[PDB]
Each structure stands twice: as structure tokens, then as C-alpha cells.
Design an enzyme around this catalytic site. Structure first.
Site, short mmCIF file in Angstrom:
data_model
loop_
_atom_site.label_atom_id
_atom_site.label_comp_id
_atom_site.label_asym_id
_atom_site.label_seq_id
_atom_site.Cartn_x
_atom_site.Cartn_y
_atom_site.Cartn_z
N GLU A 160 0.83 -1.18 -0.11
CA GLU A 160 -0.15 -0.13 -0.10
C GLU A 160 0.87 1.25 -0.10
OE1 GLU A 160 -2.59 -0.80 3.44
OE2 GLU A 160 -4.07 -1.82 2.13
N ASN A 182 2.47 2.03 7.92
CA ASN A 182 1.51 1.14 7.45
C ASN A 182 1.30 0.43 8.62
OD1 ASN A 182 0.39 -1.42 6.55
ND2 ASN A 182 0.00 -0.06 4.91
N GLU A 405 -13.27 -9.21 7.58
CA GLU A 405 -12.02 -8.69 7.74
C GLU A 405 -11.52 -9.98 8.77
OE1 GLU A 405 -9.69 -5.94 7.50
OE2 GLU A 405 -8.70 -7.46 8.54
N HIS A 473 -8.55 -8.52 0.49
CA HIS A 473 -7.58 -7.17 0.62
C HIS A 473 -6.56 -7.71 1.37
CE1 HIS A 473 -10.25 -3.62 -0.76
NE2 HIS A 473 -10.93 -4.73 -1.24
N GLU A 474 -5.45 -7.09 1.16
CA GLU A 474 -3.95 -7.28 2.01
C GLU A 474 -3.50 -8.77 1.70
OE1 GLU A 474 -6.29 -4.28 3.12
OE2 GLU A 474 -6.99 -6.22 4.21
N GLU A 492 -6.91 -6.22 -3.29
CA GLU A 492 -6.59 -4.65 -3.33
C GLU A 492 -4.95 -5.08 -3.80
OE1 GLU A 492 -7.77 -1.39 -0.53
OE2 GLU A 492 -6.35 -2.61 0.47
N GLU A 498 -8.83 4.18 -0.92
CA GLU A 498 -8.89 4.27 0.65
C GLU A 498 -7.78 5.18 1.07
OE1 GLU A 498 -6.44 0.26 1.92
OE2 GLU A 498 -8.67 0.43 2.49
#
Ligand SMILES: C[C@H]1O[C@H](O[C@H]2[C@H](O)[C@@H](O)[C@@H](O[C@H]3[C@H](O)[C@@H](O)[C@@H](O)O[C@@H]3CO)O[C@@H]2CO)[C@H](O)[C@@H](O)[C@@H]1N[C@H]1C=C(CO)[C@@H](O)[C@H](O)[C@H]1O
Ligand SMILES: C[C@H]1O[C@H](O[C@H]2[C@H](O)[C@@H](O)[C@@H](O[C@H]3[C@H](O)[C@@H](O)[C@@H](O)O[C@@H]3CO)O[C@@H]2CO)[C@H](O)[C@@H](O)[C@@H]1N[C@H]1C=C(CO)[C@@H](O)[C@H](O)[C@H]1O
Ligand SMILES: [Ca+2]
Ligand SMILES: [Ca+2]
Lengths: 704, 705
Positions: A160, A182, A405, A473-474, A492, A498
Site C-alpha cells: 500500500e 503502515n 475482515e 484485501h491485503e 486490493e 482508501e
């Protein structure tokens, strides 16, 4: 002695040979220009827990025992993609290398396409090579000069980061500032970068270094020797520092070098997908499908709302904390009434689904606590009525997108996975957005190690058994596995929209992602922010999205994905409903894609033909210098009339000073039409081109 | 502040004195009959840091007593299975709330003092300044009053399969190197580190046992000795990053226990460990949890006579790819239908409940030391193992098959397959499972006894309970009384078992120590019953010899307590000594009462137990290298009652090494007025079945012994 492999069009030539110490060496030229200088290939193995020293050597002492050549030329069709059919055409050279000192052999397979080279190591089952651990892979990519690179810091836990554009010799001095804060990050070198890596050479070439089919192996990053300008594979270590547990027969993922003197050809390359195994989901076409969605999401990302139900507890424990007895914080967006409002909006404007985050117990402790039993993925908060929301969404023809999540607690997620997927099936959810925020649990592992790569795929394969689509994501960035498992409709795994709320993304960000991150798979970038000033959502958030409204519209075409979110809140789209029309109209799957203009870091202009239609959609995204396009619509059908709607930056539009200034013009277009459009600083434009199906459509309209 | 506190046992023999010292460190001491057991010792923990020291890492000093509460508890409960019908939980309690000004946070240290020992634990209440925290090291001290004799095994994060060493505390350092023998997975941590459930004998006549109870959501505790001052300190097991515990308030550490008495037998009689565990959580336990006496296709492979693997022609295997039907049988695969049926026949003919079978599923070719992730699927049988036919056949014979789940230490793999594995057991009539964790743990970096794996072992047991399945886990963390809470955990090996008698042998005194150490906290699946002590008869290449006489093997069914008892030898060897086998056939598995007649760690253990819901008693004696002479007094029998007694003893010239199979069997009458002089040989012992006469015809022709 030397082995030579040539591309089908004869433009590329790969020369292979072993040096005087038996080290595998390869090189590549394109149109007689050096792309890859003589570079070695091989691996070092971990010494077997106490000959033992020679066995660690899998990099030299090789003799060419045998060589096999072959040509492949077949076309296949992805379930979803940038075009209807993909041609897989290459000349192959497989070299069997025998290592006398260890009485074992390996195979290095090379596949050369008109747009690049792919190679991988193969380890046959044999008497002297069964179980082995990789200490380090030593695949080199020797550059012929100090190229300009578009890169992000090499990291075992996050991607990211904003991209940096600099000479290879400048990376070392820029690394410190390139590594921004991060939640979970592990940089590994002052000259380490991630793949796919994009470069532009002084002699007019565009080179992309990446990997394909990352399965049962650790994620590859690249470490730069900035003295000799050599990039070398640097795998992700496990909790003990090792880089791969192998068992023959087995193969490493492919390593790719995509090259052309035309940047547009880098975007057009399908080498990554072509190197992946064919689709393994027999009935994929019957249930896998693109998804356009909105969601109760931006509220929490901006800080306007919260994922948590209450703010009065110092911590929570699932199965013990009784949320019904806690005081609502008055900021919980995932409540039945609010969710229904989104369902209404989605149905009214043609969206397929609505994502809702913060619906389940546990969000109070979701961030940075390294909490094992953080979520159960099935128990809703007191204000989220699963059944009523399901009933309503279904009646309105809307699908709810599940949110999983994990807070990076992986054993916990796996233990709850079957019950979680069954819960989805029992309550009408057929797509799930997963996440892995925080340092991985088991503690000691990184997001991109072999261990986690196994998990991400395990999650996708199990999801396929439940006919569920996954958007992770991640997770480790894609390498084309979507060909094999089409239900992985998104990741993502890069800096998304975001972050436009976390300080902003560089103005040129979206002019780089298609050349880097998108190679290997689509991204859930969540475009569509109309109110670019985050303080309007949350007074304490002064972050500003680096884009004009017109460029946001363009992203539905320039940021390819079968999964597209309209990320802003309904109220903001209602304020600019005329511009919102493009988001409502734009397709998600394509029969054809034409890369009209492309220059990494500056501009990208793409035209795509909606699958099973005669309609085209165009988008242009530009950097800080804006961009002037001289569009030629000769890709339209001869003799046909089209209703074109142009959404463009108004004069003097600017991402910072005047982002909401746009114009909308409607007229007629034919394959003889030509149009001049200007994308502002951090701006762009979008065009819907629909074939006329009735005279009563061109009425009052004039040629553009 | 707050003058030192005094806590006394119900009988006034033990006194625990607590006080915070001048630097704010919680300190405790313990005396027994006015003799020092524990010298002033501090309590506390150091936490992981979240240019200078962070006071938040300090949870060991700077404390002040904010409040104290006392209470007395006296209640009796009944375990589902155990050494006696009822257990009395009687203690005096002292709870001290300790406030730490510099960090504005508090903890509680709770002490429970029984007539036979002290237990203490730390409690961390939910509060503003203490929620999530990581333990760097626990600093619980146990200061010894002298250079005691200890019965110990090397402190290790991965194995407990070591022979015991008997030495002074001051001699541990010099003996550690030789005490650490080769093992598939081992991680010693200190030249003076030992495992808990540590037994000691003091020069002033005391017996001290240091251990822990209720090891849940926490890392396993070992003990590290400061041999300059004779102070033991808690040494927890680290995770892959070196940390020792992820905590979240409210939470508690497990209990730490000091069991002491001037009579070694009282150490065995103590129920402090079980009493400190949470009450049974399996509501319907009594309806399905039950003791199990079994035999199994097992010794074949342990000795090398047979193999777990189906074929020998493959360099490695890949489940789902390797087609075993096309492979050549190695001719040594014991887990084949016909052979399994022979065992089922034998089990039924002699009254056993179950038959264990290992090597029944695909994958055994690569089971050992490859750190293989996808090593087993726990459901796919080899070509020669007919699951359904065996199930039908066993059912027809009134036998139950015991499932085998060796994981080869690949834990994520086992968890991913667990529900399907347990469902497969349910669908095929398997009600009990023997699990295993041989090899270095996967996830790689973790140890067998860290918080991570302790969570896994309990997870496996709790899930098994949902399926009404009993668990016997080998290589798991040694027990700490959790069986009270989850009675379906009927066993663990977690110590050096009979299998090592085939791997070179166990020390002659091994079984005279295990009851004082390993057994405190839960039963062991020791797999006794080897009649042919020469392994070379099973496999000529195996010259290992079991260090025992046949009579001592019989004794273990009484001296090595367990609701799970295996008769480990092969049917053919029991056929050779059927008269001696009768004791194994007759002995019970659960008891209403237990009387510890004789006990001295490392020398001898003699126990008498009354079979549950019966008027029958069983006696066993196990001895070390010096043998042992017993003067048995049967006054524990019921007055006025007659008993049919059968004595299985060592022949006068018996010897574990030179004459292990020499035994005698005598049958006669016994009453509470009877007395018998018996001698256990070197590495020998004896066994006695004492059945109450129900019909005068039973005593016909018999004389008094
Ligand atoms: C939800 C989001 O959380 C994490 O993002 C954090 C950033 O990585 C941090 O750098 C930090 O950003 C701050 C800036 O550094 C600072 O200069 C200022 O602009 O304020 C910013 C916000 O405080 O803090 C961010 C929030 O903690 C995490 O790294 C990121 O991956 C997470 N996004 C995913 C998680 C969820 C929740 O289930 C989903 O909503 C998103 O779609 C995911 O992508
Ligand atoms: C099956 C068994 O394997 C492992 O036992 C090994 C020992 O730990 C090693 O020390 C070694 O013993 C050798 C001696 O060192 C040597 O001096 C000589 O006497 O030969 C011995 C045998 O070669 O080798 C042993 C075998 O590899 C492992 O540590 C132990 O825990 C394992 N036992 C469990 C596994 C299974 C299989 O699923 C079950 O049958 C048993 O009940 C388990 O307790
Ligand atoms: Ca994210
Ligand atoms: Ca074992």
C-alpha cells in the site's frame, strides 16, 4: 554449446548456456537491443539438519544433459476479462541440467512470446532430490542501463505504498522516504522493490519484470545491485528465515520479462495469464459473474462512521461480551435502516450488490491488537438484522456482499471458514470481501510467505466449493491465478482509493497501476469519489482525493476489474446525478479492448467494447501535466451510428483547486469521427458510445 | 504497607506468609510442620515492550497491597473416572490485590492452602491501564531450603520422552548433557532447566513436588534452577518470535503448585491439581465417556517387525495423486483387514473393549521427519484396509475400533481436516482416537508446548466432545488436571512410555517415578503388558530389552493409573503366557477407592484399589534395581468377608535382565486378617486380584493364603 530460442515473429532472441563453473546463464534481446544482459539462474538450498555442503548448491556445477523444443499456439476464453479470446502462442526450450557432484537434475523451461520471455525451474522426482528447503532463489535480471523505474519498496507485508519514479541508481537514496507508515510492513533492503516492476529505457524500450502462477511457493520481490544494475529474485522468508518447503516433483512460479518499444503493448500482453494453469472450475460460467456495487464503507474509512457498535468497553471477548447491554456510539453505520437505504439506491440505479462492513461482533478490537479470537464471522451486532436485510435485498433484486475482515488472525479464520461460508449460503451471500489487516497470526509469518500464499488459495478453493466469489484485501498481489480459479474476482494488494482519505495518493497513481499492479489480476480500487474533500464527511479529516470528477469516471475503464465499486455515499452521487450516469452505464466485462494511448506516470487512454453488445466505453486518466488526446474512432463499426456522451474536465478544472468542474456533451459518432479532448492536472474523461437502435434517439443530436 | 499476611492450612501444619518487600516485590514463603519448604520467594512478570526503559514492562515490583480477602472452601465432587469415587476440595484462601502506582494498574495473586500443599496464580482484572499485553517472562520463584535430591528430566519445549535422572540439585548442571538423549523433536533451554511435575526429597525428611494446574490459554511452564542459591524460577515456552504469552484482561495464569509432606504416599494421594481445575463442562459426560481396555496392531511397527507404510517403492507420496492401488505391497503392512480381524477376535475372546490400528490411512510412507504439510487426510484408507468390513466385524464381536490420528506434527493440516476426520469417525463407529504429533511443529517456529499448541490440543479435545469422541493424545503438552473440565481427554503419553523399551529401554526405576511426576495432572497411556521382553523376537535387528519382569508388567495396570489401558504385546505372546494374562483380563480400569500402601520415588510403589461399583480389590507393586520386600496387611478389606485372591509374583530367581519371564501364580482365600510377605525382584513386582466371594462354591478347594 549455446542454445538459442526465438520468438514467433523473430524479434526476440534468448540465448542460454552454462559458464565454465556450470552456472546456468541466459540473455535476451529485442529487435537486436539488449534487454537482459548475461544473467545467472539457480538456487541455494538450506543445509539439511545435521556432501551436506555440496547439497546446498543448486546454482552451478551443471551440465546440459538434454534439450527439448516445441511450439504452442492455442486460443482460450476467460470467464471475464479485457477481451473475449486470448491467444497463447510461444516457442519453448526446456533444458535438462545435470549436476554431477550431487547426482541430481533440474529443468529450466523457457517460453518466448512476441512480447516477452517466461521461465521457471522444474524439480523432477528423483533418488537424490525429494524434500528440500530453499535458502534463496538466485534468478537474475541484468539491465543494460540505468533505466527509469516505477517502483514501490520491497516489503513482506504491504504493497500500500505510493509509487516513485526514478533512475535505478536513485532508488537507494529514495528508499527511506518511499517507505511510509503502515499497519503491517517489513521492508527488506535499501534497494529492494516489489513486482510487477515497470521500467523505461533510454533506448526506447519498456520492460516489466514480474512472476506468474505463484502457487506453493513464497512471493518473489526484487533486490537491486545498483553497481552492476542487476535485479535478483528475493523471496519472502517464513518465521524461521527459510524461503520455501519443496517436495518433488514441483516447480517454481514463472518469472517474466515483458518488453516492447510501445508502452501500449505492455498493457496488451497476456503472458502472465497464458502461463497459468487452465480453469479448474468446470461450471464457472454458470455462477461466476462481474459485480458493480456500492456499500456502507466510505463512512468508516473517512471517520464519519465506525465499524464498532459501542465505544464504552476497553476490549471485548466474543461469547462473553453482551452487546445488547452496551451503549451504541451513535456512529455505527451498519444498522438495518441505513443498509436498506443503500439497497434502495443500488436497486434504483442498476447496481448488483451492496457491501456492509462492521455488521458482526468484534470490531471494537479489530485494529493492531494481534488478537487471535477476533471475529466469528457469523454473529451480527444488535442493530444488524441479517434475515430482514436479506429479505429486503432479495425483493429489490440486490445481493449483499459479505465482509470477512480477519484482522490478520489466520488460524482463527480457517477454524471458522466452513461455518462462515455456510452462513453466507444460508443467508443469500454469494460474494465476500476478505481482509488481513495487522501482523499475521501465526506470529512470525509475513503476508506474502509460502504459508500465507497457501492460505489465500485455500480460501479461494473452498469458496469455489460453495460457489462463492472472493475479493481479498491485503493478500499477496495477483499473478494470474484467476485463470485457474475465476471466482477470485478481486484483490486490493496495492494502494487503493482508501488512501485518498489517508492523506491522498500521488496524482499519477492510476497512470502506473495498469502497468504494474494490474498485471496478474484486477484490483478492487473502489473508484467513484465525487466529493473529493474528505472534511465534508468528517470535519477532522483534511485529506483530499487527488482527482477531478471526470477522472474518477474514467477509472471505470482505465482501472480494469470485473468488480467495480462506486465508493462515495448516495447523497454525494445525488448531488452530481448527471455525472453519475456514466458509472450507471459503464459495463464490467469486455469482448474487446483497444489501448489508444499509454505512457507510465503520464497518461492512459483505453477503449473497450462491452461484452455481448455493440457499445464502447472510453476512459483517460492523466498525471500532473494533464494530457491532450486526439481520438480517432476508427474502431467503431463502419456504417453504424452511435450516441456518444462525453464526460470531461471543464476548462480550468484541476484536481486540487477545481476538481468538481466537468462538462457533459451528447452527440453522434461514427467510425469517421475525430475528437480533441484535454485531461486536466489529475484529470481525465469518460465516454459512453452506444450503437443507435432507434431513430428516436439521434433526434436533436448532432455529430461531435 | 499492610503487615505481612499469614495463611494456614485447615490442619495448621502448613503456613504461607506473604508480604511485599521494600522495593514493592510480592514475596511469599511456606513452612510445613515448622520446617521451611519455600524460602522467601518473589512473584511477578515482565512484559514485552509495546532511549529509556518503559515502566509498563514491569509487572514484578513497585506494588503495594490495596486489599485482601480471605475465604474457606470445603466441597466434595465426583470425577467421571478416577482413582476414587469422591474428591474433597478443602482449602483456606487469601487473595491479595496489588496496586502499582507507577503504571496505575492492579493485579491479584490468589493463594489456596490445603493440608497437602499450596497453589497460587496471578489474575489480571479488566481495567483502564491493563488490557492487551504480552508476557516476556514469568518470574515465579520457588526458593529451596537445601541441595535436595531431585527426580528430573531436561527442560525442553518439544519433548518429555526422557529417562529420569536422580541427583542433587547441585549435580543437575553436570548431568544435563548426558540426560538429553536423541529425539525426533527436542529443544532444551538451559544447563539447569527441568520440566515441571518435579519431585524432590529433602535431607530433613520432606517430599516436595513443584508443578502447575489448569494450563489453559497460556504457555507451558518449566523450571530453571539457579544452582548457586537453589532457587527455581518459572521458565515459560516461547513462541516463534520468542514471546511467552499473548494475554487479554480479564485473564489468569495457570496455578502453580507446591505439594509437600513427610510421607511420600501423601504426594500420590494429593488431589490439589485436579481441585484447582474448573468443574466439568461436559454436561452429558456420564452417558458416553467411559474407560477403555485395548490391544492393537501397534507393537509390530514399534519394534520394526511390521510397517505403517503400504509400499516401499516410492521416494515420496502426494495425497490425491499417488495411486496406491498401483503400488507393490511391501509385505510388512500390518494394518490389513485379515490381520485386524485376528486382533478383533482376540480382543473379544478375552474381554477387551477396543482395538487400535495404526497405518490404516494413506500417507505413512512420508510420516517421519520431512516437515511435510499435507501429510495425512485422516480419512482415506489404504487398499488393504476395509473400513466398513472392519466396522461391521468389530460390531458383530462387540468390539470398538480406536481411530489413529498421527499428525506428524503438521497442525494446520490436522485442523483443516478435523471436522471431516471426526465426522468420518462418527460415520464408521469410532468413538475414541489416539492422536500424535511426531516431528517439529508446523507452523514452523512453534514448539510443542507453547501457548499456540496448547490452544490446539484443547481445541481438538473440545471439538471431539461435540462429536462425543474421547481423545488420547501423544506428544501433546503434559497434563495439568484439565481432564476434570473435559473428561473426554482420557489420555496423553507426554512422557517416556513403553515404546522406548523397544528403543533401547527405559531405566529400571522409571515406573517408580512416573506416578510422582508425570501422573500428577492426568493419566498416561503407558501401554504396559509386554510379556516377551526381548524385542529381537519381534525383529532380529532390534536388540532392545524391556527392563521389567512379567510380574511387574502386570503390576503396572494398578501402579500406572489410567482409565485407558493397553495390553501392548502381540496376541501370540499372550497365548504363550495365558495364565499370567488372566490378571490383565481381570483388572478393572476405574476405582471407588485407592490405598497407597508403600511408596518411595525411584525405589518402589505399592497400591491397592477397589474396582468401581464392586467389592473387589486389585493390588500392584513395582520396584527398582534393588527389588523390594512387602509386608502386606489386608485390613482394608471388609470385615467378615471372604475373598478369592490370585497372586501373580516374581519367581525367587526372577530378574528383569537374566530371568524376566519367571513367575508364580497362587490362588487362595484372603480376609481382612490376612497378611502376605512378597518380594519384588530387580526390575520386578507383583499383582493381586482380590474378588469377594459371591457364592460359597467359588471357595471350594481353596485354602487361606
Ligand atoms: C482501514 C485501513 O486501515 C489501515 O490503514 C492505515 C494506514 O496504513 C496508516 O498509514 C494510517 O493512515 C494515516 C496516515 O498515515 C496519516 O498521515 C493521516 O492521513 O491519517 C491516516 C489515517 O489515520 O492509518 C490508516 C488507518 O488505520 C490499513 O493499513 C489498511 O489496509 C486498511 N484498509 C482495509 C481494511 C478494511 C476493514 O475491514 C476495509 O474497509 C478496506 O477496504 C481495506 O482495504
Ligand atoms: C514412533 C516413535 O518415533 C520416534 O521415536 C524415535 C526416538 O525418539 C529416537 O530417539 C530413536 O530411538 C532409537 C534410539 O535412539 C537408538 O539408540 C536405538 O535404540 O534405536 C531406537 C529406534 O530407532 O528413534 C525412534 C524412532 O524414530 C518419536 O520420537 C516417538 O515419539 C514416536 N512414538 C509415537 C508415534 C506413533 C506413530 O503414529 C505411535 O506408534 C506411538 O504410540 C507414539 O508414542
Ligand atoms: Ca487495505
Ligand atoms: Ca511418542
Amino acid at each position: 554449446m549455446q542454445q538459442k530460442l526465438t520468438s514467433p515473429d523473430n524479434n526476440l532472441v534468448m540465448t542460454f548456456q552454462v559458464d565454465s563453473k556450470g552456472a546456468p546463464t541466459y540473455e535476451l534481446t529485442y529487435k537486436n537491443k539488449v534487454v537482459i544482459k548475461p544473467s545467472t539462474l539457480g538456487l541455494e538450498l538450506k543445509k539439511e539438519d545435521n556432501k551436506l555442503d555440496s547439497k546446498t548448491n543448486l546454482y552451478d556445477g551443471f551440465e546440459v544433459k538434454d534439450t527439448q523444443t516445441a511450439t504452442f499456439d492455442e486460443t482460450w476464453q476467460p470467464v471475464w476479462g479485457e477481451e473475449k479470446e486470448i491467444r497463447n502462442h510461444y516457442n519453448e526450450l526446456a533444458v535438462t541440467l545435470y549436476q554431477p557432484m550431487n547426482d541430481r537434475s533440474i529443468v529450466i523451461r523457457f517460453r518466448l512470446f512476441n512480447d516477452g520471455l517466461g521461465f521457471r525451474y522444474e524439480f523432477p522426482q528423483q533418488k537424490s532430490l525429494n524434500y528440500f528447503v530453499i535458502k534463496e532463489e538466485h534468478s537474475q535480471f541484468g539491465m543494460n542501463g540505468d533505466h527509469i523505474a516505477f517502483w514501490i519498496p520491497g516489503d513482506y507485508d504491504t504493497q500500500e505504498y505510493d509509487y516513485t519514479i526514478s533512475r535505478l541508481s536513485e532508488i537507494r537514496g529514495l528508499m527511506k522516504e518511499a517507505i511510509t507508515p503502515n499497519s503491517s510492513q517489513t521492508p527488506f533492503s535499501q534497494t529492494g522493490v516489489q513486482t510487477a516492476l515497470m521500467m523505461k529505457t533510454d533506448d526506447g524500450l519498456y520492460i516489466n519484470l514480474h512472476e506468474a502462477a505463484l502457487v506453493d511457493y513464497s512471493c518473489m520481490h526484487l533486490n537491486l545491485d545498483d553497481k552492476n544494475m542487476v535485479f535478483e529474485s528475493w523471496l519472502t522468508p517464513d518465521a524461521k528465515g527459510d524461503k520455501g518447503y519443496m517436495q518433488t516433483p514441483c516447480n517454481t512460479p514463472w518469472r517474466t520479462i515483458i518488453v516492447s518499444d510501445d508502452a501500449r503493448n505492455i498493457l496488451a500482453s497476456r503472458i502472465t495469464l497464458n502461463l497459468n494453469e487452465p480453469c479448474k472450475i468446470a461450471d464457472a460460467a454458470s455462477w461466476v459473474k462481474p459485480v458493480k456495487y456500492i456499500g456502507v464503507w466510505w463512512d468508516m474509512i473517512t471517520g464519519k462512521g465506525s465499524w464498532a457498535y459501542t465505544d464504552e468497553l476497553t476490549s471485548v471477548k466474543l461469547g462473553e461480551t453482551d452487546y445488547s447491554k452496551t451503549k451504541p456510539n451513535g456512529k455505527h453505520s451498519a444498522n438495518t435502516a441505513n443498509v436498506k437505504r443503500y439497497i434502495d439506491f443500488a436497486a434504483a440505479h442498476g447496481f448488483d450488490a451492496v457491501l456492509v462492513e462492521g455488521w458482526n461482533e468484534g470490531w471494537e478490537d479489530w485494529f493492531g491488537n494481534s488478537k487471535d479470537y477476533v471475529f466469528d464471522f457469523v454473529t451480527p451486532y444488535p442493530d444488524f438484522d441479517v434475515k430482514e436485510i436479506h429479505r429486503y435485498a432479495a425483493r429489490k433484486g440486490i445481493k449483499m456482499m459479505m465482509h470477512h475482515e480477519t484482522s490478520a488472525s489466520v488460524r482463527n479464520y480457517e477454524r471458522h471458514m466452513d461455518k462462515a461460508y455456510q452462513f453466507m449460503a444460508d443467508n443469500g451471500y454469494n460474494s465476500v470481501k476478505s481482509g488481513y489487516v495487522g501482523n499475521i497470526i501465526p506470529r512470525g509469518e509475513h503476508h506474502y510467505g509460502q504459508w500465507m500464499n497457501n492460505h489465500y488459495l485455500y480460501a479461494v478453493k473452498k469458496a469455489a466449493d460453495y460457489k462463492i466469489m472472493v475479493n481479498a484485501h491485503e493478500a499477496t498481489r495477483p499473478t494470474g491465478i484467476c485463470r485457474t480459479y475465476p471466482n477470485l474476482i478481486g484483490n486490493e494488494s496495492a494502494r487503493g482509493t482508501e488512501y485518498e482519505s489517508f492523506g491522498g495518493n500521488k496524482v499519477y497513481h492510476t497512470t502506473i497501476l495498469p502497468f504494474t499492479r494490474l498485471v496478474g489480476g484486477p484490483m478492487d480500487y473502489t473508484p467513484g469519489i465525487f466529493e473529493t474533500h474528505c472534511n465534508k464527511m468528517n470535519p477532522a479529516n483534511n485529506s483530499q482525493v487527488r482527482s477531478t470528477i471526470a477522472r474518477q469516471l474514467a477509472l471505470y475503464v482505465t482501472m480494469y476489474s470485473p468488480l467495480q465499486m462506486a465508493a462515495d455515499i448516495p447523497e454525494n452521487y445525488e448531488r452530481f446525478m448527471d455525472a453519475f450516469q456514466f458509472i450507471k452505464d459503464v459495463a464490467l466485462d469486455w469482448d474487446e479492448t483497444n489501448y489508444l494511448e499509454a505512457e507510465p506516470g503520464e497518461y492512459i487512454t483505453i477503449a473497450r467494447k462491452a461484452k455481448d453488445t455493440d457499445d464502447w466505453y472510453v476512459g483517460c486518466t492523466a498525471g500532473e501535466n494533464g494530457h491532450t488526446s486526439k481520438l480517432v474512432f476508427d474502431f467503431l463499426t463502419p456504417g453504424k451510428q452511435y450516441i456518444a456522451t462525453v464526460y470531461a474536465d471543464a476548462k480550468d478544472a484541476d484536481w486540487k483547486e477545481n476538481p468538481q468542474a466537468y462538462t457533459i456533451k451528447k452527440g453522434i459518432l461514427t467510425n469517421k469521427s475525430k475528437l480533441n479532448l484535454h485531461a486536466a492536472n489529475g484529470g481525465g474523461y469518460a465516454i459512453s458510445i452506444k450503437e443507435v437502435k432507434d431513430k428516436s434517439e439521434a433526434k436533436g443530436l448532432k455529430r461531435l
